[PDB]
Design a protein around this ligand. Structure first.
Ligand SMILES: CNC(=O)c1c(-c2ccc(F)cc2)oc2cc(N(Cc3ccc(B(O)O)c(F)c3)S(C)(=O)=O)c(C3CC3)cc12
Ligand SMILES: CNC(=O)c1c(-c2ccc(F)cc2)oc2cc(N(Cc3ccc(B(O)O)c(F)c3)S(C)(=O)=O)c(C3CC3)cc12
Length: 552
C-alpha cells in the first residue's frame, strides 16, 4: 500500500512566504553570513512529496505479537477520563488555525456558543458515524535552516479545529497517561532534560560491558501502515474508558488516523493519505508506541542482552550488554533487518558505540562540564547551527513560536545558549522594555506561554542549580561552537563575554526579577562570582503536531 496517492493539484500556501533571511539593525551583531540562512516554502513541496511517497510491505512475526500482548496487558491497567468541552477548549492555542465553519481559536477559548455548538455537533457525528473519511488540510511548513554541502519543506496534515477539540475530549487523558504505563522508564517525554541525562548516565553504568546505538527510521510517518494504526487503536481500547470515549476513539481511528483525503489551502483535492498524519493529537503517542513495539521486537530477534530502550516519537536509542565488538555489529544487522521487515528501515545504518558521548539522537549528544565545586556534570547539547540561524530570523521578524526561548530552556546548560542566546535576546528585551511580556514557545511539541523573567526558576527546575555555574567545557564542544560561529559569521565567544557584562549590569540596575536574571543567568560573565543559593505538569507527555497549549 502506497503511503500517499496524488492528483496533481499543488500544495498551496495560505499566507505570504519569505525564503530570504530578513535583515534589520540588530542582524549583523548576531550573524554576518546572511546568504547561508533560509526558510522553506511551498515551492519545494513537490520534492518532499516524492520523498514521502512509497510502498509499504510488512512482515509480522511472533516477537512482534509477544511484545504487543505485553503492551496491551499494561494498557489494561489505565483508566482515562473524557474531557469536557470547556476543558478541551482551554487546551487550544490562541493562534490555532481557525475553523472553516466561521469561528477561530479565540472563539473556542472564550466558549462562544457558535464554537461550542459546532463542537457538540462534530462530537455527535463522531458517535453516530464510524465510516466517513474526515477531511484534512495539507500545508508546507515554513522552517529556517542553514545551507549544507537546501532541504525541501516538511508537510503538516491536520483536520478542522472542531475535530481537534473533539480529539482532546476523547484522547487527551489517554495520550497523557498511557505511554508511561505501557513503556515505563523507556518513555522519553516523562523526563526533564536533567532527569534525562541522569537516566542515560545511570543506564550506561548499569551494564557491565555497555554498548549503545541510535536508530533513525527513514521518513517515519510514511512508514506507519493501516496495521500499525489499528494496533495502536487496540492498545487505547484496553483502557478503562467512558463509552462515548470508546466510540469516539474507534470513529477517529477509522475516519481520521488510518487515512483520508487531502485538501490544499485553496480548497482543492491533493490526493489521499494511508499513513500517519503529522498534525493530529495521537501523532506523538502513536509514533512512540509503534517505534517501541517494533524496536522491542527487533531487540529480541537480534538477541541483544539486557536492553534498555529510550523512545520519544520516532527517535530511538538502545543501551545494552556488549557481546563483543564483532558480535555487536552482527546483531545490529539483524536488528535492522527485523525493523525493515516491520516497515521501518533506517536512514543511515546504525552503529554500535562504546562511549555514551559518541551517540547522537534527536540531534543531541551527551557531554561533560564542571560546576562551581569542580565536580563533573553531564548535560545534553547539539550543533548550534540551526538554533543560531533561527535566532537570526527571529531577531528581524516576530514569529508564532520563539525558538530562541525554547532553546534557552531546553539547552540552558550549553556554552552557546548561555553565552550567545541569553546575551543577545536579553539585550533586545532590555532595549524594548519587554522583560515581563509573555512569549509563546514549544517544549516537546506543546505550546507554552512564558515570561522571560521566569527563566531562572524554570532553568533551575529542569537542569538544577549547576546550569548557572558550568565551566571547563570539553575541547570538542568548544571547537564545534567556535567552528559554527566562523561558518555563520557570528562574532567569537570573547565578544559575547564582553556583551554579557553589559547585559548583566543593566539587568542588576533594574532590581527585582530582572536583577535575579542578571545574577543567575550571567554569573558566568564576571570574575567576582556571586554565591548562587536556590530561588524561592510540564513533562507528562509529548504532543508534537497535537495543537496543545498551556499557560503559567
Ligand atoms: C531517544 N533519544 C532521546 O531521548 C534524547 C537524547 C539522547 C541523546 C544521546 C543518547 F545517547 C541518548 C539519548 O537527547 C535528547 C535531547 C532532547 N532535547 C532536545 C529536543 C529535541 C527535540 C524536541 B522536539 O521534537 O520537540 C525538543 F523539544 C527538544 S532536551 C529538551 O534537551 O532534553 C530530547 C527531547 C525529548 C525530545 C530527547 C533526547
Ligand atoms: C572565568 N571567567 C571568565 O570570564 C572566562 C575567561 C577569561 C579568561 C581570562 C581573562 F583575562 C578574561 C576572561 O575565559 C573563559 C572561558 C570559558 N569557557 C568557554 C569559552 C569562552 C570564551 C572563549 B574564547 O573566545 O577564547 C573560549 F575559547 C571558551 S571554558 C574554557 O569552556 O570554561 C568560560 C566559561 C563560561 C564559564 C569563562 C571564561
Amino acid at each position: 500500500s502506497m503511503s500517499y496517492t496524488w492528483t496533481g493539484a499543488l500544495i498551496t500556501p495560505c499566507a505570504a512566504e519569505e525564503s530570504k533571511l530578513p535583515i534589520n539593525a540588530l542582524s549583523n551583531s548576531l550573524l554576518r553570513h546572511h546568504n547561508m540562512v533560509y526558510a522553506t516554502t511551498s515551492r519545494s513541496a513537490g520534492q518532499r512529496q516524492k520523498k514521502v511517497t512509497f510502498d509499504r510491505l510488512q512482515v509480522l512475526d511472533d516477537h512482534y505479537r509477544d511484545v504487543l500482548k505485553e503492551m496491551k496487558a499494561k494498557a489494561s491497567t489505565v483508566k482515562a477520563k473524557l474531557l469536557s468541552v470547556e476543558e478541551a477548549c482551554k487546551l487550544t492555542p490562541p493562534h490555532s488555525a481557525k475553523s472553516k465553519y466561521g469561528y477561530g481559536a479565540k472563539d473556542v477559548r472564550n466558549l462562544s456558543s457558535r464554537a461550542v455548538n459546532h463542537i457538540h455537533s462534530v462530537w455527535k457525528d463522531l458517535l453516530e458515524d464510524t465510516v466517513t473519511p474526515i477531511d484534512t488540510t495539507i500545508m508546507a511548513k515554513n522552517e529556517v535552516f542553514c545551507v549544507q554541502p537546501r532541504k525541501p519543506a516538511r508537510l503538516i496534515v491536520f483536520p478542522d479545529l472542531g475535530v481537534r477539540v473533539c480529539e482532546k475530549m476523547a484522547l487527551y487523558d489517554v495520550v497523557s497517561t498511557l505511554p508511561q504505563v505501557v513503556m515505563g522508564s523507556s518513555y522519553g517525554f516523562q523526563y526533564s532534560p536533567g532527569q534525562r541525562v541522569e537516566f542515560l548516565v545511570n543506564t550506561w553504568k548499569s551494564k557491565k560491558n555497555p554498548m549503545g546505538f541510535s536508530y533513525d527510521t527513514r521518513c517515519f510517518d510514511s512508514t506507519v501502515t493501516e496495521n500499525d494504526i489499528r494496533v495502536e487503536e487496540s492498545i487505547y481500547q484496553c483502557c478503562d474508558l467512558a463509552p462515548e470515549a470508546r466510540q469516539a476513539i474507534k470513529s477517529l481511528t477509522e475516519r481520521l488516523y488510518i487515512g483520508g483525503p487531502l485538501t490544499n489551502s485553496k480548497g482543492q483535492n491533493c490526493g489521499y493519505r494511508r499513513c500517519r498524519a503529522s498534525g493530529v493529537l495521537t501523532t506523538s503517542c502513536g509514533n512512540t508506541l509503534t517505534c517501541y513495539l517494533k524496536a522491542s521486537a527487533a531487540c529480541r530477534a537480534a538477541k541483544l542482552q539486557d536492553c534498555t530502550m529510550l523512545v520519544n516519537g520516532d527517535d530511538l536509542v538502545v543501551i545494552c550488554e556488549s557481546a563483543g565488538t564483532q558480535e555487536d555489529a552482527a546483531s545490529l544487522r539483524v536488528f535492522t533487518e527485523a525493523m525493515t521487515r516491520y516497515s521501518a528501515p533506517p536512514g543511515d545504518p546504525p552503529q554500535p558505540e562504546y562511549d555514551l558521548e559518541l551517540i547522537t539522537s534527536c540531534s543531541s549528544n551527551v557531554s561533560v562540564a564542571h560546576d562551581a565545586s569542580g565536580k563533573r556534570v553531564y548535560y545534553l547539547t547539539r550543533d548550534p547551527t540551526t538554533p543560531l540561524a533561527r535566532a537570526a530570523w527571529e531577531t528581524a521578524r516576530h514569529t508564532p513560536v520563539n525558538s530562541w526561548l525554547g532553546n534557552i530552556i531546553m539547552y540552558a546548560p550549553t556554552l552557546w545558549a548561555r553565552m550567545i542566546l541569553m546575551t543577545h535576546f536579553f539585550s533586545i528585551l532590555l532595549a524594548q522594555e519587554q522583560l515581563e511580556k509573555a512569549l509563546d514557545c514549544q517544549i516537546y511539541g506543546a505550546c507554552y506561554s512564558i515570561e522571560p523573567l521566569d527563566l531562572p526558576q524554570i532553568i533551575e527546575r529542569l537542569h538544577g542549580l549547576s546550569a548557572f555555574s558550568l565551566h571547563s567545557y570539553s575541547p570538542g564542544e568548544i571547537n564545534r561552537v567556535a567552528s559554527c560561529l566562523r561558518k555563520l559569521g557570528v562574532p567569537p565567544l570573547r565578544v559575547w563575554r564582553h556583551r554579557a557584562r553589559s547585559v548583566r549590569a543593566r539587568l542588576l540596575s533594574q532590581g527585582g526579577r530582572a536583577a535575579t536574571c542578571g545574577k543567575y543567568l550571567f554569573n558566568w560573565a564576571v570574575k567576582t562570582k556571586l554565591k548562587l543559593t536556590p530561588i524561592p505538569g510540564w513533562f507528562v507527555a509529548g504532543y508534537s503536531g497535537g495543537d496543545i497549549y498551556h499557560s503559567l
